[model samples]
Target: MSISISYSTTYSGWTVADYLADWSAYFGDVNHRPGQVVDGSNTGGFNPGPFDGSQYALKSTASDAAFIAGGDLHYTLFSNPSHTLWGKLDSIALGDTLTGGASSGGYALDSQEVSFSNLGLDSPIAQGRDGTVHKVVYGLMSGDSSALQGQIDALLKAVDPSLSINSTFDQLAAAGVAHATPA
Candidate 1:
């Protein structure tokens, strides 16, 4: 049977201050070590080292719901590598749906590091303290269209409905009714 695939996208944006604000708020309720400021002469005349940090932001959650619904295509076609292929398969998936949303979150984390480094500095001093600033961002995405398709496909074909796809596949292989070609 001929199959058609559908896809969707979304985006969000935030700033470094925004991220710091969020972090402060999140950590406000939690108890932690007190932030400290060490003086210069103690650590070799106060050489500010590379500042580094990471932030995790929620990315877009693309849902291919209703795409060939009531069929096995969603299950079989939307599996692991299949979901990753959607971006290459469809023009709709070939754009930034979550860049903006994560940009601010990224920037906020970055700026926080910079601000922290420059806290006690008085103007830019050439021969003064040289420091490095680094920022890292982590993003979480849900509702992957392709993986869901594979899962949905496995669910519908189960007789007991309790058997997972992996288990079912193992059973088929053990019975010699199914085999996988080694790549």
Candidate 2:
């Protein structure tokens, strides 16, 4: 199978409030919500946009958590005879829109869209604020097809057999994934 992964990392000097303010000024709209529209599909359609230079601050002595926000990893898997498996990191920076007047606007939210073909599956896991990697993993697997979930579970188990799927799901749901669950 062929798999592709892509990600972006940011380290800005701006305070979290300043970052959010600038982000709101540059991309906020009445139609969208904060930290909820990164993938641009909410308004325009399927289009990934540029990253807004916003940074969320990690609490003191919690620098590791700084990288846990506003990022995504996308994986596309292609198998023989047209079968494929795909996964993504949904919490990227922003999604861009081309307005009717030839102007472009940024939709600063992550997307919840995935594509599968010929039984191939694509899923996206979003990062959570809590200090756990599996939150996003569960989020990704929850919305994925059975085959895709199987693959992801296999991968996770391969990495660590002691991993707790139910715990991760519960923690993620409690953190914020429940509110953001896709319709």
Candidate 3:
């Protein structure tokens, strides 16, 4: 069966419609599609960082009804934004890469360590794209109370050392970013 993937992000910026356009462009260029847990139209999830939610709460199941309702690091996927594919904050291993699926896999195409002082976030945000999709890990407010940005950077650097950091969405998949083979 064919797959239709919509995009949703926890952080504010462009609308979901524009985000879908970017993913569609990326997939079109790669000639690949994201794997779906379901056989119909699926929505690939994203978070600018974990703390981005209604009223700046951690985007977790307990606080947000829009979330999939489980896990320490509220990662999920849905035919309609419903399913629990999350992991505990401690479960995120040193080299674990953020993903848009039920399981974790793949390497970074590009990555950036972001600071959000304006957002009232203490820890620097970590965000990057895997071979098939993009993801984020919000700091402090999203359970990074241990101050693990160093480990997080190590994880991203393991997959992508140079860090083709960029300030905009379109630049993420641009020239300097390597085209990683999906796992």
Who wins the lDDT comparison?
A: 2
- Which lDDT value does model 3 have at 24? 29
User: How do the residues 130-157 of candidate 2 rate in per-residue lDDT, one tens digit apiece?
Assistant: 2132333222212212323344344434
lDDT per residue (tens digit) for residues 1-183 in model 1: 111111111111222223233333332221111343222211111001111112212212222111100100111123432211111111011112223122243211111111111011111112111210000110012112233333323432343343332333334334333233221
TM-score for candidate 2, residues paired by index: 0.22
- Whole-model Cα lDDT per candidate? 0.21, 0.26, 0.25
Can you list the residue pairs that collide in candidate 3? 50-138
lDDT of 3 by residue, 25-127 (tens): 3222211134523322223243333322111111222221111211133333332233332233222211112223232232111221121111111221122
Which residue segments of model 1 deviate by more than 4 Å? Answer: 1-150, 153-157, 166-168, 175-177
Clashes of 2: 7
TM-score of 1: 0.17
Using TM-score as the measure, the top candidate is 2
